[PDB]
Design a protein around this ligand. Sequence first.
Ligand SMILES: COC(=O)c1c(O)cc(O)c(Cl)c1CCC(=O)Nc1cc(O)c(OC)cc1O
Length: 213
Amino acid sequence: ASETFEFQAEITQLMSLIINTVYSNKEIFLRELISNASDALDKIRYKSLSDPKQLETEPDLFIRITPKPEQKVLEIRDSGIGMTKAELINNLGTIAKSGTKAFMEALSAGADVSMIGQFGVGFYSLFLVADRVQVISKSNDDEQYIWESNAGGSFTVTLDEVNERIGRGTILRLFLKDDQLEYLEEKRIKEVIKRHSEFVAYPIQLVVTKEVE
Ligand SMILES: COC(=O)c1c(O)cc(O)c(Cl)c1CCC(=O)Nc1cc(O)c(OC)cc1O
């Protein structure tokens, strides 16, 4: 059984705006997700300073990107702090965010969509290239859960009994729009990373599937 929740009014507005925008530099979405991953990694790392055992659930700190072409899916994973069920509901939708309205007004004035991250709502830039997203997360303090949204007014949270076990961390599973399948390509992904995420303190791994020769 999955519980359904409504997004705070302004967040629904932002998503509708983003998923329908004409913007030409949509690649910045990956920069934002990598940045968020790094911040979650910083949090578990900082937390481990006074409680090292917090790391035992997943000793390695990394960001991993996995293209799943057959499903037109792009996964961005990190072994950061992760989110409990309550945090998913809180952080991803029900609580108002300081910059949602301000960012939208900035866009109306001509601001570059690339500024989204500075308004603290970069997560939603994922809708530039995807029309559906599943956030799979495992915090040391809770079971693994699935938060899902299609840019509509509500989202779902479900106990995870269908995905690979995450030691600790979060997986953003993006279901790419048909005209944005280029982000499934190793070449494209690498250039976006080098260009926007040169200064990341964690290893960024890319999972590539090749047919044997
Ligand atoms: C802890 O953040 C995450 O686990 C995480 C991640 O690993 C990858 C991501 O792409 C995203 Cl979006 C996240 C969630 C980031 C987030 O929204 N954190 C957050 C939000 C809040 O509103 C808040 O105040 C209650 C605190 C947060 O940490």
